Amino acid sequence: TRTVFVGNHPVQRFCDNRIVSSKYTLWNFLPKNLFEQFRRIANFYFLIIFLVQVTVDTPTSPVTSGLPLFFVITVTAIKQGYEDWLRHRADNEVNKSTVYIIENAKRVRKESEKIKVGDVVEVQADETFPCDLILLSSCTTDGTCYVTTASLDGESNCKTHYAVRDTIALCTAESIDTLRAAIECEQPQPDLYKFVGRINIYSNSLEAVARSLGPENLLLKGATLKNTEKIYGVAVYTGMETKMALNYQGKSQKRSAVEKSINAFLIVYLFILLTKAAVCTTLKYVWQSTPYNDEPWYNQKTQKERETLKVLKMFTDFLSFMVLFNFIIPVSMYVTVEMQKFLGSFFISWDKDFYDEEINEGALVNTSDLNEELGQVDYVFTDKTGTLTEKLQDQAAETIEALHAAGLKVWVLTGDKMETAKSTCYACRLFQTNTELLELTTKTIEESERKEDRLHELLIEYRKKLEHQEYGLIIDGSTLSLILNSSQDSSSNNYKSIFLQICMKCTAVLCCRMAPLQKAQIVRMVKNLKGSPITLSIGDGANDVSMILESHVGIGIKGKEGRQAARNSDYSVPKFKHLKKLLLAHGHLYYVRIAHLVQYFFYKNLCFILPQFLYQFFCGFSQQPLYDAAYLTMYNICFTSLPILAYSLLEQHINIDTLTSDPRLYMKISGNAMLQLGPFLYWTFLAAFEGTVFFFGTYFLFQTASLEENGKVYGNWTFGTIVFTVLVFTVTLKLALDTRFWTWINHFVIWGSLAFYVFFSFFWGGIIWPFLKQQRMYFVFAQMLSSVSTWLAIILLIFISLFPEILLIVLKNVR
Amino acid sequence: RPDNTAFKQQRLPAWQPILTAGTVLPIFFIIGLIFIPIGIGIFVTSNNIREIEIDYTGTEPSSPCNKCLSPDVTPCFCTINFTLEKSFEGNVFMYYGLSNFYQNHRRYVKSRDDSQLNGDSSALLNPSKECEPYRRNEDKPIAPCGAIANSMFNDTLELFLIGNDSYPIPIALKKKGIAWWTDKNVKFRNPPGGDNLEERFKGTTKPVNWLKPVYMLDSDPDNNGFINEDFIVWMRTAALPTFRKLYRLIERKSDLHPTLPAGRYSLNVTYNYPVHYFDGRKRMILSTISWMGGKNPFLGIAYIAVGSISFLLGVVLLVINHKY
Ligand SMILES: CCCCCCCC/C=C\CCCCCCCC(=O)O[C@H](COC(=O)CCCCCCC/C=C/CCCCCCCC)COP(=O)(O)OC[C@H](N)C(=O)O
Ligand SMILES: *[C@@H]1O[C@H](CO)[C@@H](O[C@@H]2O[C@H](CO)[C@@H](O[C@H]3O[C@H](CO)[C@@H](O)[C@H](O)[C@@H]3O)[C@H](O)[C@H]2NC(C)=O)[C@H](O)[C@H]1NC(C)=O
Ligand SMILES: *[C@@H]1O[C@H](CO)[C@@H](O)[C@H](O)[C@H]1NC(C)=O
């Protein structure tokens, strides 16, 4: 509640029309982004290991460990910078707009950010209003102004507005000549059209004005002056303080369900890694408690080692086990996921089905981070006037039926009025003829007493039903405001909770007179309902930007209204019937590709490290790596990363055309099925079982004198390679069984990665080059390969390790 | 307008296999049909292999090496008798076995400089930081530095066959051929400079524990330094706390009689290796080698277990699908 003066001469803490929506400052983007990014437990763990690794012990070259960590941070830095750079450009586009105002009865030209409270602004025909303004003088008769409130409510029709009655006759002859008007106004509030004001216009002579400003007098920011000549507006509210702004709520970024499961899995293996390291250190000193176990006569410690504190040695020893098994958490998985979303997003753009020949424009992907998000959608929120209708789209009715058969509850939240909105819902097959409606509208709502009355009686009669296709709910803008805002009075039975109980078991929900911020609130309240159901918001208007940004994934249709919704939205499609192909076909495939991608990496590295952990028991607990230094490094780089990489890019779990044929298949992966506790726990035990077979299978093999006809014994580097050879062959062949869509690239990558391992081992092992201080792996692979017994054992261990997998696949066919 | 390439539209040709239950039913039988014959094939070979183990560590008053167990400043000797009820006909190999010798220890394994052992004259003078505290002795570097070379197993095991008379007959032993072909000829090389191995090692000294210099291993010049078969074999890591290394090789006799006839045998033990301090044990292994290798029943048993299970589950899977 402040006082606004038209003349500003009565007888940037507060934004004077300087609006900025950028999350990060261009000057301090790097320190802010890095500090927030390192806050994540996943990224902090990668950094801390790198600093420890160089400091105390390096099982592999530190260059290999830190570089992808430096890579993954840079890629995220580009993505956060690019998204921020768009916001500044959009803010610049709005700010750098020519606007004309009257200063000292002189017309001058300046930008939007210069306009301040109480200023008189001359708004010409067919130009958007810089800020919400009181209508004082119009040269047109009776001060009748028509505006199309396209941005405010997504509808484009003329809205009548009236100038102040004393100044309606004021033409373009110095209307504001040192005006002493003192407008007293309320605080800026997000009630859209609703407004109360107390105007006090006093000329040089004594005058008394008791006029009360109303919705018709005030013109809201963002509207388009249509079929109206030049008018004069006073900025009673300026800048952020508008009904067009402060409904954005800023941007809270987008978080996906799969990325939530990655962090949930990463913290589990971080605890296993702590357990693995802790048990080794505890068992190590118990084992070394014996006088001769530590420093026997053959190997003796140096003088530097002797002169160290026991507590200090324990700390570095614990970290030595930590850095040894740090391969449990795969850095390559974060790099691969980064690339999988980058290359995987282009498939949507290249799709011909997302091309509308009528407007000759195709779908695009603004945000590539939420490719997997489309496969988990179970709540859909549409626009209606723009998206659903145009009347109905070519396949608008068929699309709604497809979503319902796919287990997606679809909603038709619109800002359109009640009278015309109910007509469409019957036509679009959403509301069948037999469905009666629970019209919680202003016609059926009277003051506070009937508020709980309607809610409780629904709790009595409507709740008792759970037929299902008989009850449909209708809410209005005023009713929804009371339900959400004024629900805090009842603690025992909150009106929000009872409302959510109503909506959870309805065939459809149709809302009317919804302001853009209300669309965010209703979507937000659904989000906080017995967990976090995945919501999809689709809209094609400047008002829909609030709900599109509020939901998890936003789809922005590019229509006659404009491209305001498209640019902020994660994805854009030209027709509503394309929503079926988007989330059913692409959404299902995108999730299944990455869900199996995540589970494979964690399974892959557990088989990598578990034999290394078991080898500590047979070793002296001295953090002795079972594999060569080169083999440890290249396991994640070039050996096994490429097979799963090509799998994620192009793999159809079910035929892409078949997915659209039967929309029931989307229900299989609805509840994060592939990343649930069930499938995850099986993946870990399968990795643990394969790890045990790899080591102890070789351990019992090495119980003989020799494995060659020449009777030559084999070293520990032969023991490492035998385990590693089984490891690479099993893990890669495990992916082959999973893959059911074999392409030429998939054939080339899978079999090529196996052949590369054999080739590289021969190349690395067999040629001496004078730049390694150690030549442990000289001829081990060829000697390992040159034994008949080793060949038989390797084929055995591959089949035994794959026996639980092959048993499950055959069993899955029956019952 | 969008490019209609099958790759961009995700329409690439695919094999797209569909393996039903009936598709994989013959696979269970065929795997069982292969494993059982090959499994019993390798298992019967293991039993045909004849191997004997004789422990000469002592640790018992009845053991004749008890006097060698006690510390003797003079060299000690053992005479251990053992008898074989089964003769050896094929090639006979001799192994020395150490138990609870943690050769896998990280500090121990890295304690070697392969650049120095490769015959590089530069690295010979100054070994790297890996071999510590055996880098240098009395400010003189050790040519085979490191704990691995320092603690080389030095015991002489000789075998005497005794006939009808009390006179014993020594069995001929071959020093060469026990090491890997590539390690001897390529990995381990003598320094290039000079001809006499004396002149090559001027600045370097022998290892601390060694009583013989690195250039005085064997009389022959092709085993004198860095190329001795026993030295190379000991250099290779054990891969297990309990291990055995190829000590000697006994070729088949030129005469028609078996290589090692079944009879009473007497063993020399020179016992210069104090293994009892860390609860270690020493054993000597006589083995006959087949195509697969030494006597390993695990490989034969393992095929039988998987082979029988696969065939048994093949029948079980056959029955359950037969009901449909
Ligand atoms: C014969 C057929 C072919 C066989 C394979 C041949 C070799 C193929 C090569 C690589 C495999 C595939 C690729 C595998 C990638 C992952 C491998 C990996 O992460 O391996 C890592 C090292 O990788 C590199 O140093 C390569 C450069 C990585 C960054 C640049 C490369 C990626 C950049 C690409 C271009 C940019 C894309 C995004 C753009 C965004 C713009 C906004 C190592 O993983 P580790 O898990 O082992 O981490 C070290 C470990 N913690 C330790 O204890 O030491
Ligand atoms: C065979 O290898 C033996 C090592 O297993 C080694 O015996 C060592 O002989 C030297 C003779 O001086 C001694 O070495 C250590 O003994 C002194 C006195 O106790 C210590 O102060 C030093 O550490 C020194 O290095 C020992 O008698 C013995 N080494 C040990 C500690 O057992 C010889 O290389 C070989 N023995 C033969 C062939 O006689
Ligand atoms: C080896 O055994 C022979 C048997 O004749 C005997 O000289 C003595 O026990 C041992 N000799 C040496 C020096 O090892």
Numbering used by the authors:
A (entry chain A): 19 to 29, 38 to 416, 651 to 726, 743 to 1091
B (entry chain B): 27 to 350
Show the paper's wording.
Previously reported BeF-bound crystal and cryo-EM structures of detergent-solubilized ATP11C both represent the outward-open E2P state, in which the extracellular gate is wide open, and PtdSer bound, but not occluded, deep in a longitudinal cleft in the TM region. Unexpectedly, however, the molecular conformation of the BeF-bound ATP11C-Nanodisc formed with DOPS (3.9 Å) is rather close to the outward-facing and PtdSer-occluded E2-Pi transition state. In the BeF-bound ATP11C-Nanodisc, the exoplasmic gate is closed, and the head group of PtdSer is occluded and thus isolated from the outer leaflet of the membrane. We therefore speculate that such a high effective DOPS concentration in the Nanodisc drives the transport cycle one step ahead, from the outward-open E2P to outward-occluded E2-Pi, even in the presence of BeF as discussed later. Membrane slices show a significant difference in membrane thickness in the BeF-bound E2-Pi form. The membrane around the end of TM1 is restricted in its thickness due to the strongly kinked structure of the cytoplasmic portion of TM1, giving a thickness of approximately 35 Å. In contrast, the membrane around TM2 of the E2-Pi state becomes significantly thicker than that around TM1 and other parts of the membrane. The thicker membrane structure observed in the E2-Pi form is likely due to the relative orientation of TM2. In contrast to the membrane thinning observed in scramblases, the protruded membrane structure around the phospholipid exit of ATP11C flippase suggests that the phospholipid poised to be flipped to the inner leaflet is momentarily located at this position along with TM2 and then released smoothly to the inner leaflet of the bilayer.
ATP11C is a member of the P4-ATPase flippase family that mediates translocation of phosphatidylserine (PtdSer) across the lipid bilayer. Most P4-ATPases function as a heterodimer consisting of a P4-ATPase as a catalytic subunit and a CDC50 family protein as an accessory subunit. The catalytic subunit comprises a cytosolic region responsible for ATPase hydrolysis and a transmembrane region. The P4-ATPases transport their substrate through a cyclic transition of four cornerstone states, E1–E1P–E2P–E2, according to the Post–Albers-type reaction scheme.
